[PDB]
Design a protein around this ligand. Structure first.
Ligand SMILES: *[C@@H]1O[C@H](CO)[C@@H](O[C@@H]2O[C@H](CO)[C@@H](O)[C@H](O)[C@H]2NC(C)=O)[C@H](O)[C@H]1NC(C)=O
Ligand SMILES: *[C@@H]1O[C@H](CO)[C@@H](O[C@@H]2O[C@H](CO)[C@@H](O)[C@H](O)[C@H]2NC(C)=O)[C@H](O)[C@H]1NC(C)=O
Ligand SMILES: *[C@@H]1O[C@H](CO)[C@@H](O[C@@H]2O[C@H](CO)[C@@H](O)[C@H](O)[C@H]2NC(C)=O)[C@H](O)[C@H]1NC(C)=O
Lengths: 170, 324, 324, 164, 324, 165
């Protein structure tokens, strides 16, 4: 999208990862599987939860609102009263609909940013020790087992450990 | 040996709208627009609404014969008129500052009705009987308002009357009355006997004088005569004095008012049901925590902001792409 | 061998504003603010507006001598008053509920003017001639309104007059009239011949009895007397009864009204032309599909929302950098 | 630039490419020339068009709106009416101008994002087969002809690689 | 060797709110909400406000005996009523169109008070002394308004009076008067001596006749009679004529008015001080160039837009991360 | 961080650099020290200054605004007048607070984007002549002195290269 990650360089999503919004699918000698990223999924939940609450806060509930009557000699006053009701209605409908459209654009771009940022967090951990394929996948040069995989989706990947990579890298 | 990075997806068919694109299916979304009501007029804080039925406020407060069910009314959460509330002013005339009275009633939660000027004791020198009309008929016979008393002359004499009431209640007392306007002078004298009558009503803040407006008019409900109806709010401790040499439709029953906020009058043909709510509308009640609703502008209690919108769905998840 | 990614550019000098930066030349943009009108008052749905000229609403409806051009009028799309519309009430006095009457006319698209009480037929025992005043002079000679009839005593006799009209038009009928208040009792006698007179008017919802207030006041247009003007909307099938022993400025011509929405009263010195539009303003007509305009707050028909803005340009293309 | 592309790492625009908003240049043994990217230019046109139509949608046209008269004893009511008119006018003027400012910022950043994304789609297509100069240019190693150039501005590149 | 890119940070503890996150410590920020006032009622453009004290508008303009400090008043930047402004109408009755009068005074910056009808010169055939009452006492003795004159019969004779005033002031002239309404016909005779009296007031655009409404109302400040107060804005060159056979509370002092915009009436218990401002509220004065304030909705001068907000801080710097 | 620079791949900020918002830290044989980037700090100051001025422009000051009185038979008008004051007040409080919330989000993202762009301007200047560590740092291969450092934070680097790699 606005950040070329979602529906971009990562063409599609995963109906298979049900633990969260963003995550990994690592494939191993031990096997395959999906795993959601808590750290980044929770910050997205905290922010979106906060966005929705902020919107509701600005829109105060409406209290007792009844109509007024007017006699046949108060048409000007009756029309003034109607103009105000219709006026205030035009404005709150406008604001409500318009605020949603705008924040909907923002929210979708918020997720897009989060995927891009997660991808680039991993990419800068691995560097040489893997090659970027395309669909947001990293092909390892040095072989990462279940335990090693967990250090990548954990922010504790160890580069140096891995010039084995420099061997398979050619 | 590899690891892939990606995002969630599901069978969700919820769609939202953005500024650049429409109908964007998303994984998670919340609806902010309540569009479901109850179809029923419910209680509010346990107290039931007052149904006027085929009566309007005028009929209820003056005591139009067709409104005798309402004689019991004492407390309500809000007031309801219907599309058939046309039984009000049965003797033709103007209800002065009537809309202003309806506004006052909107902040009234209950009252005690009481006989302000008892019919059998208050008028020694005037005739209290006889004060009926075909235009207020009931049970096939001529009748009159229950809360008002049409005084006429005791055989050939209408002595100047003077009756006062002190407000000994703890609250405002709503006093109503009327002045009669015959079509001719002949009539003015068959009823009153003074061809130059006046009605004088005064308290500590009210002072008004009414002279009969004799004129030739069409008949309305069989009557060329007319009746203007008046009301005032008598403050606690204050005194109201009625003075007249003819034409006074005296007060019979008054109302001791209890103020309260959060009430009002609505128009609705919805049925009343034994149920409770915190948000009532002419169409039905609303049980929602949503910020908006498109059901009705008219509201009573604690309601979501009204809006014209048909759809107000805000996205929480991301774009949904199953790509099977 | 190279391949470069780049963006579009052009000679466009259009500038938009952002929150961070003003005057940002862009490659494409749309103007949302219509500021171009017609300088002309045009027809609306084929039907031309009604110019009142030097006359205002009061003059047009009463029949002020200076407004004889409007006697023909019957239908219009809206009503125009100018800066020189001062010919309304030629004989000094109060036009009761005048502002409300204007409001009523704002939702009237056309009417059929008719002789409600024919000047020659309706007043056998009274004097229909001789009802003119220097304050309503025309052609240099004293005259009076064309729609009202100033009745006076027929040879030192002014018998009680009674005259009713039944609305069999299928529409509301607007009935205007007046009550005259002479400066001296001497004038009262010489006009009416009864020293103590009265006018009475009564319909199904109207009822009043006017009594001449005889006093000396500053001459206005040479007249120390006053003349008060009254109106009422007579509903289908209803009857209006007039009775008087003097001081009645009788209704001569009345108007059978036709209601319609989208009409109004504006003030404009712009010329009317054989032209047509869907949006009219006091400055001129507007032909536009834009969402906004800064021409005028006052609008008739379908118009863009008015706004104080001088510029409302929304960018569509990208920042323009020719970098020659 | 919010995405550092337009007026950023691509210093200027081309007056020469007149087919669309985003595109390529390409110098070859067969010749030079410009070519606009249909895919990306179209989406921006669909999106911007939609933004403009949405703005216009929220601003409902104003119908018959005339002024009222008041007698000399109706100054309070006349002032209420005037407070209402001036009031709604302050708000709509505010909403109008303010919506445009904000959306204009979004639109310029939208394009900026569209260029940045296009450049990176190519960069990840070529990889070793080209080196990133400046001004978003790609100097080929494997020397690409007009037929191959069209595979790039196509997303169907193909990879045949040596060095370099 | 190395070179690192980075951003600024400091010891700032300023926080702002965003839609995604609250309380985000930033490096730089500006406050947009003014919440500090002066606690004082200052002058506007050098000119001091008019402090009414225990008096209200009615007491000031009529000249209630408890408002003698206000006789001197002539110019003001704005008008102040306090929580104890109850001394106004001391003789019980209605001040017709009082709220409308208040609205008029809101655009008045100054006036020249004058003796429109000199007490000792204007009424040769009427009694100008003796027009006092216990309901308007002062210094233990019965008194009366300073700007009005209570005319009474001169020894069993109350001749028809006629008094005119031509407005040669080049400004509007505010004229106040009253019509008295005794409790009994005996009181009517002892005061006026004509049983059937009338008061008549007329200008170029004013015309109204008053007749005594005699009746007994509850005593207010000891009085069972009522007095109704009236005003009118006499236009330059225009003439007002008073005519009466009793019950006229004649004008004594009137006011030539000077219009001006930016003035008004506020309710405040804050003390006036020798001080100058451009923005005044009932709480106190404001010296700010901020766009918003949450101090008070009522304003006089040039002020920041009022708003319910407690906090409006707009971020300018970036997210603050010292990471010590 | 919408652009992952601030509080992202550059974990923290420098209390030591007090000249501007964005800048460099070099570290050389001749010594360490901070240095703010005029070019990019000024543009941010121009943009933000203009943003704050633009918000204040849309919020016209409030002129004289007093209250009106009504008699006991004018409750409907008194309530109309009060509905109008409370109504407009509801809307302006909404507009003010809501405009701030939104722009605040944009402003933090604006700075973020600035840091991210400044970083990538240097990255494309150096290329081979330095390796990307973390925290937006560049470890030079060719060893650069204070005089060459100033060419980097200046946009004029110029590539005498020879790869010890
Ligand atoms: C109560 O209301 C009913 C219905 O609104 C009145 O009935 C109408 O009376 C008029 C006049 O007699 C007739 O022309 C209509 O045909 C009646 N309509 C119906 C539906 O009956 C009734 O008169 C009212 N009664 C009172 C006492 O107010
Ligand atoms: C029609 O309008 C004109 C303009 O107001 C009237 O002319 C004025 O008449 C008054 C009274 O005689 C004069 O004092 C003014 O000098 C006149 N003004 C102008 C501009 O000429 C005219 O009398 C009105 N006629 C009718 C029948 O209403
Ligand atoms: C001025 O106002 C004061 C207070 O409103 C009046 O004094 C009150 O008068 C009432 C009625 O007589 C008494 O019941 C109260 O006890 C008085 N209160 C106080 C605090 O004195 C006073 O009479 C007024 N005077 C004038 C001339 O209007």
């Amino acid at each position: 999208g606005l950040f070329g990650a979602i529906a971009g360089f990562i063409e599609g999503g995963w109906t298979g990862m049900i633990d969260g919004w963003y995550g990994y699918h690592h494939q191993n000698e031990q096997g395959s599987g999906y795993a959601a990223d808590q750290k980044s999924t929770q910050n997205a939940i905290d922010g979106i939860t906060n966005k929705v609450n902020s919107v509701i806060e600005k829109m105060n509930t409406q209290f007792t609102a009844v109509g007024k009557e007017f006699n046949n000699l108060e048409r000007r006053i009756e029309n003034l009263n109607k103009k105000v009701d219709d006026g205030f209605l035009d404005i709150w409908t406008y604001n409500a609909e318009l605020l949603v459209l705008l924040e909907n654009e923002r929210t979708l771009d918020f997720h897009d940013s989060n995927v891009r940022n997660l991808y680039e967090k991993v990419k800068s951990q691995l560097k040489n020790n893997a090659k970027e394929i395309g669909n947001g996948c990293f092909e390892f040069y040095h072989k990462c087992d279940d335990a090693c995989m967990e250090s990548v989706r954990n922010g504790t990947y160890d580069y140096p450990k891995y010039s084995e990579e420099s061997k398979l890298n050619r | 040996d590899t690891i892939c990075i990606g995002y969630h997806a599901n069978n969700s068919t919820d769609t939202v709208d953005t500024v650049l694109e429409k109908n964007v299916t998303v994984t998670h979304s919340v609806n902010l627009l309540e569009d479901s009501h109850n179809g029923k007029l419910c209680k509010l804080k346990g107290i039931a609404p007052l149904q006027l039925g085929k009566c309007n406020i005028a009929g209820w407060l003056l005591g139009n014969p067709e409104c005798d069910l309402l004689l019991t009314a004492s407390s309500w959460s809000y007031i309801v008129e219907t599309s058939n509330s046309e039984n009000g002013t049965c003797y033709p005339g103007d209800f002065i500052d009537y809309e202003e009275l309806r506004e006052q009633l909107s902040s009234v939660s209950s009252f005690e009705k009481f006989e302000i000027f008892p019919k059998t004791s208050s008028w020694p020198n005037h005739e209290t009987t006889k004060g009926v009309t075909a235009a207020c008929s009931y049970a096939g016979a001529s009748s009159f308002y229950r809360n008002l008393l049409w005084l006429t002359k005791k055989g050939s004499s209408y002595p100047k009357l003077s009756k006062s009431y002190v407000n000994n209640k703890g609250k405002e007392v709503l006093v109503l009355w009327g002045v009669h306007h015959p079509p001719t002078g002949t009539d003015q004298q068959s009823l009153y006997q003074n061809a130059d009558a006046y009605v004088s009503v005064g308290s500590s803040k009210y002072n008004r004088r009414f002279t009969p407006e004799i004129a030739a008019r069409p008949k309305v409900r069989g009557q060329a005569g007319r009746m203007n109806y008046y009301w005032t709010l008598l403050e606690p401790g204050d005194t109201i004095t009625f003075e007249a040499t003819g034409n006074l439709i005296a007060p019979w029953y008054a109302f001791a008012l209890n103020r309260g906020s959060g009430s009002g009058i609505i128009t609705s043909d919805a049925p009343v049901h034994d149920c409770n709510t915190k948000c009532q509308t002419p169409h039905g009640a609303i049980n929602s925590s949503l910020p908006f609703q498109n059901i009705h502008p008219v509201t009573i209690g604690e309601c979501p902001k009204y809006v014209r919108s048909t759809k107000l769905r805000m996205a929480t998840g991301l774009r949904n792409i199953p790509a099977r």
